[PDB]
Each structure stands twice: as structure tokens, then as C-alpha cells.
Unconditional design. Sequence first.
Lengths: 174, 407, 407
Amino acid sequence: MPAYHSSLMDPDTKLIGNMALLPIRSQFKGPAPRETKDTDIVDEAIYYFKANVFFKNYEIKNEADRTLIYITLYISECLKKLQKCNSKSQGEKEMYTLGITNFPIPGEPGFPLNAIYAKPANKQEDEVMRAYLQQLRQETGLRLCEKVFDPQNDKPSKWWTCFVKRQFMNKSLS
Amino acid sequence: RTIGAELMELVRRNTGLSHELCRVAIGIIVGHIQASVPASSPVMEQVLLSLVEALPSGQVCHDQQRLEVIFADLARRKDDAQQRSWALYEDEGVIRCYLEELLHILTDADPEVCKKMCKRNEFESVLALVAYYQMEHRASLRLLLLKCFGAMCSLDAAIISTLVSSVLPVELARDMQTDTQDHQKLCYSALILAMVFSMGEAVPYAHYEHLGTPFAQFLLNIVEDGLPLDTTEQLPDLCVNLLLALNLHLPAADQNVIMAALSKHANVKIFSEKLLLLLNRGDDPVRIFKHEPQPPHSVLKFLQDVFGSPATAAIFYHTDMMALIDITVRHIADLSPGDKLRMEYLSLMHAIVRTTPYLQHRHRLPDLQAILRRILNEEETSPQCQMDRMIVREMCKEFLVLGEAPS
Amino acid sequence: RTIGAELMELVRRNTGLSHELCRVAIGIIVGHIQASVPASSPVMEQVLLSLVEALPSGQVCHDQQRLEVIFADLARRKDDAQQRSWALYEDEGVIRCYLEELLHILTDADPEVCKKMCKRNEFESVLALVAYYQMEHRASLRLLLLKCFGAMCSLDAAIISTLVSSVLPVELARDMQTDTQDHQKLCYSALILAMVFSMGEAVPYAHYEHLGTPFAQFLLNIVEDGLPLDTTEQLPDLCVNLLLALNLHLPAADQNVIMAALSKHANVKIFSEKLLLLLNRGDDPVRIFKHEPQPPHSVLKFLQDVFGSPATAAIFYHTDMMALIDITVRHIADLSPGDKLRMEYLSLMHAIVRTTPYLQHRHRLPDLQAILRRILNEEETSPQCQMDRMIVREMCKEFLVLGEAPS
């Protein structure tokens, strides 16, 4: 059967490059509009993370799938740093520092999906992309730390750090 | 234009020499035809410069080809689920042949070749052997993989971060507590564990199920009591160097898993005797590799953490603490200003006064008082020398009798 | 004029390569600068010719110096009567170091150097080790001497005459019957004994106190029953190759010490099974070395002596003799005229008819009769071919039914 795709795409949803500039519920600042609903492109990708890393074939139906694939690849970067953390406060400090890092973007080397992603043509669209992703890289990390850490010991769970070796298909943002 | 690199590849193929001796043989031959036949000196000097100072376009090294062929089969034999769990064919002689060949290449060939082919595609080939080790149960092959990991740690430090962050140290720490019969595998496992922990990088929290306090008690029981099968007695001096290396990344001695092992042990004497024979000389047995950034001094890091609590300070016998004060004092003075270690011995000494009754017996207190007054009256202005004086003031301020004049 | 010899000495010193690979490295380097830089071809071709085609006057090889230093200490440690019988100082680590160095030189250096320094002053240095072996009781050193003797036998055959005529084969044959616990020393002792007896040279009569019939029974009990400590099962196939080599110099099968072992043994089957697997292929396992004059074929020499008496002929089971006749017949025909072996298989066959009831069962008699009539009707005129026909006539004359027409 197929993997889990994004249901949130709507024709009224803006496009950046060939991705889906979708609303995000965050206190962080960026080009992403603020959402009112109780579900977002982030809460989905965290719902569907543990299941989508076992599949080996993903068919890109729309552009919101290109936004989900990015997060699902970045969550595997959070867990590499979080498994080394001994307290949630130490994780939130590590999740900040990682989002500030300038990962590759569509068009340049490092990005594993340069072919099936559309780079920004103009410089203004480039500046919007680098600030949309950084808004995802920050709210993703902030929301994992609520889940990874067992409140009984305030230390990472083996049920999340078992997916450290499970890349999305085999790709990584590095 | 490229002769000196095309000859080294020819010579390593048809002779089997290492990279170093490949350059020696050519530099000697050339350097001798130059001298005996001066008519050929202009040609020879160009040839020597090509050595001192790349390969043709399509030409690829022999050692690079083999590492494409070895890492590819061993990963194919890892992805063979049938043959691993449900054996039918013989595999011990083929794998033993590819792992021997691998060990001669990492040990002899050019490190920059063996670095890139191990650093390729985010350490895809290293991490496979780390899984094949977890999957394999035969000690004839687990031993060769360890000799191969020990050669990959010598090349770069990014590989050490890859292994320590992997499941390797948890399988070694689990195989050593379980399979104590094999002596070589127990002695190499304790060497590799000290290699990968040498740099001080932190690790996942899940490692501390098998690298925590019960693993330290296992190592202390060996240091103190030894094993029967250890005839040559290498293993205590390897289970010491390992404890020093686990304690490198571990901060906050009150939260330290190792120190809970000492305070739980009935009586440690042989572990303490060996720590002082290393401090008397100031040798870091963990520091095998010349990789930067150089981590701290493993011994002083340990003793600074021992004397970070009074439960762990009482392990030292009376005669040994007085020998520790005689050494620490001797190093504080014999060391020059601007050295990095002088503040460690000072912080170590500050830790002794707090957690021990040093002020009741006052061993070598006058010789100490004269050295601290000197260090304060030193007019050096380096930042490091200001860190030393900053410690001494805190030391005298906390304990006034270390500021009084010697009398 | 002398470059190609002065470079090989430089390269072996600063690289440690063998003699062969020392010439390969220079021929490759030179042969590549010649091709890439044609301006230097006249110089290079002179250099290559010096290799294909002596040293300066005072210059002496490095390997020759070491053999002056090694053979001189080991003979000094032999003439040290106090330290040998009344030990005070440690000697196992120094001697083990000189014997390792010796083994790498005999194995890698130029044989003509290692020949003359061993053949010097009537084998003064070889004969010392042969005495130091008799004097030494430690198996860690008796083993390295054997590996060194095995390398000296490969150089020349005058050294084999020196060792076999010495007391070495009597101490090995005495240590093997006594110290059966050490498996490596028992397996190398049986190899060296086959080396030195390989040439067929006779020996002193006193050797037959420990190399006579009781030593053969010891080797047959191992071939048949084996040892417990022999896990890899190399030793039967070494105690066979040794019996074949003792029987080389031994004439007159009625006077043979080995054949008295067979006729005394209760039942040999495994020794006979192995003799036929060697005869089916016509391989001489004793013939390790390429030294002239080439001695006879060890197997056929044995079986010619087995069937030199009817007491030793009955060791073969019925099914095995018929397999021996199928082989002997197959070789007599498949062999060409002018070969040396064809008369051996013929003399072997003549020996079977006398000492066995071949004329009652007559296995493969028709195929045999047709081959002998052919050999008589061969018009070849070499001396060897006349020796074959000379045998056939004697064979048919003695037993007429081998001359009749096949029917």
C-alpha cells in the first residue's frame, strides 16, 4: 500500500519554489502564515514519522509532500543530537542551535533531492525559502522535545532513539 | 609532471611495500643515480620534486579499488539475511581474507585514500562493519574487525565520533561482561573502547545501560583481583586506561557513574597505586592519537572528580595521599608559567583540601605556602597565568592558612 | 659499471625487501623513467644491464655482516659451558632475536651469500647449531633452529650431506619418540628429517639406533592410529613422507630396517591407502628441492622393496592390490619410450608376480600381455629403451604366461 501523504494542501495554499508554503502554529518569526487549527504540516509529519521511515517508495502527488519530506528528513537530525541530551532544557537549547544552522536548500549541493525540487529563481524567493525552512526547523525541534523525553526520568526515550538509524528512505540533510 | 606519483603506485603493486617505504625506495634509487651519473641530474631532480611536492585522470589507485571491492562485499554479506541467521554456505575463510586485506591497507597505504573511502557517503562503510559486528558471533572475525577499527581511529577523529555514537561500545561492553573466556577479544575490546572514548565527545544516554556503573565495577574487579586466564597481565593496565577515558566526557562528579563504582567497592588499592605511577610521570595513556582538538588530561580529570566528593576521597590509603601531595606540589613548582597543566594540579590541590583532612596533618604545607605566594607575585600577563593566580586567591581566601608565611 | 648491485644493497637496507623484489622495484622504476623520459634512455639501459648481467672492493653486503655477527654469537653461546649447564643470565630473548633475524636472511637474501657463509671453513657455523640443538632443551628455540635448518637445506645439497651425517637426525628421532606433547616440534622435526634424507646419501651406522626399526613402528603407529593432540591431521602425511625418505638410501630389502617394521605390525591399512593415492598421480612428496643429482622415485623405491619379500607383500588388502595393478598397468602404457620411470613400474610389476599369487587371479593380465609384446616390438634404440626390453624378456622368460598372446 502507499505511505502517508499530506492532506492539508488546498489550491488557496501558496507555493514557494515547488513546495507548499503552509501555515504553521509557532511563536517563531518567518514567512509562514499562522494557523488556527489543531493540526499542521508539522504535527502530521511527527504523527507519520515512525511509519514513513520504514517505507521504501514515495510518490510525490503534490507540493505539500515536498514540505513533509523535508521535515521528516530534519526530524532524523534532531534525534541524533537529542539522544545525547540528559535533560529537556538541554534539548531545547540544542534544537535552537540547529535551526539557526544554514542547511542546504533546493538548488545547491548537500540537498539530496535537487532533481525533484525546484530552486528559487529570483533572490527574493531564495530569501523566503531560507526563512520558511528555518521556521520549520525551530518548531519541529521544539515539539519533539515534548515527546522524546520521558517525564519520569526527564531523559530520552528508547522508543524514539531507535529511529536514529532509520533515515526517511536513505536520504539526509547533510 | 606526475612521475613521482605514478611510480609509487607501480612499486606498491609489484612489491607490496607501505606508502612510506615506497617513497624511500624511489628517493634512494634516484638520489644514487643522480650522484653516480651527474649527466642525469636534471632529470632526477624533477623526479624528486614530484615526490616531495595527484594521479592521471582515469587512473585510480590499487588500494582504492580494493576498498571498493571489500567494503562492497562485506556490506553484501551484511544484507544477506538468509546466510547470517540461517547459514548454508561457508563464509569464515572468505571474510577472514577480506578483513586481513583490509587491515594491511589501513595500516600501510596512504591515509588520505583510507580516509575518504571510509568517510564516503556519511560513513556508510564504517557503520556496516559496526552492524556486522553486532550480527556476527564468531570470535575469529570479531577480532579482525577490532584490529580494523583500531586502524580507522588512527586516521581521523570524525570516525571516532561515528563509532562512539554507534552501537559498537555497547556490544563490546556487553561481550566483555559475558564472554570472559576469550582473552585476546577481551584485551582488544578494552583497547578499542579506550580509543573511541579518547576524544571526550559525549554519547547517547542509552549507552549507559552497559557502560555505566555495573561496567565500572566489572573493570575494577579485574584491576583489583584480575582474571585467571590473564597470564601476561596486560588487562589491568587496559581496564585502567579505559576508566580514565570513560570519565573524560562525564561532568559533575556528583552525577558520575564511575565514582558510584568506587564508593560502592569494598576496598580499592591497586587502582589507586596505578593512578599515582601515571601522575608521577605525567603521561596520558589514553592519548594514543595525534588528533586535534587535544582533549584534557585523563588522569587529572579523574582525580579532580575523585576529590569532588568526600565519599570517593577516602579510597586512598594514608601513605598514598602523602605521596600524592608530594607529587602535586612537585609539579606545581617544576612547571613553568603559561603551561596549561599548572592550573589542573592547582585545581586538584584545591580539591584535596576541601574533601580531605589536609589541615590536620598539613603534609608539605610550608613548601606549598611558599609556592602560592610566588605564583601570586608573578608578574606574567598571559591569560593562562591570570587563571592560575585567580585560583590561588580563591584557594587562600577559602583556606586562609595557605596564605600565611611559611613557618 | 656497478650501479645495479650498489642499488640493491641500498634498497634492501632501507626497505627490508627480499632479493627478488629488490630487483623488481629497480627494474620497474628505471623502466618507467626510461619510457616517460626518453631523454634518459641511454643511462637507464646501462643501469638495467647491470642488473640482468659484484660489489665494490671494500664494500660488503649487510646480510653478510649480520651472518658474521649471528653465527659468531651463537657459537660463543655454544662454547659458554657455564651458562649452558649452569644458567645464571637470561638468554631466551637474545637468542630468539638472532634466530629470527637468521631465518629472515636465509629466506629472503641472496642464496649465494647465505651459501658461502654456511659453507665457510668446512661448515663450521652449521655444525655449531647442530650441537647447540643437542645442548638446548627449550622448545621455543629448538623450533626456530628447525625453521633455520629447513632454509639451509633449500640452498645447497652439500649442506644436506653435512646435517644427515651429523647428530641432528638422531636427536630429532629421539625427541619425537620422547616428547610427543609438543605438536609443532613433532611436525617440524618430521619435515626436516624428510629434507635431509631426501637426497639418498648414506649415513653412519650409529644412526640406526634411533632411526631403525623401532623408529618406524613409532611412525606407523602414528600413521595408523594418529595422536590425540593432532587436531589438524598433518602428521600422518608427514610420517609417510619420512618413511619414504628413510627407505631411499636403504638397499637390499631383505636387510631393510623399515620392512621389518611392516612385517612386525599387526595390520597396516592406512599406510597402504596413502601409498596408492601418491602412485595414482606419480608425485614424489619427498622431492621438495630442485637439487641435482636427482635421486630416485621414493614411492616406487618403497614398493619395489615391499615386494622384494613375500612377508611384506601380504600387507595389501585384496581390493588394494587390484587397484595397484590397475595403476601400474596404466602407467606402463601411458608412459613414452625413453622415460626413466617406465622401467621402475616394470620392475615393480616383475616384483608383484614373484611375491604374490598374481597367476591365480590374473587381474588385467590380457591388457598386460599386449603391452609387453608392444614394448619388445618397439624399434627404439636409446639405451634406456633397451633396458626396458631387457626387463620384459626376463619377465616373460621367468613367467611364460606373460608372453602368450592375449586370449
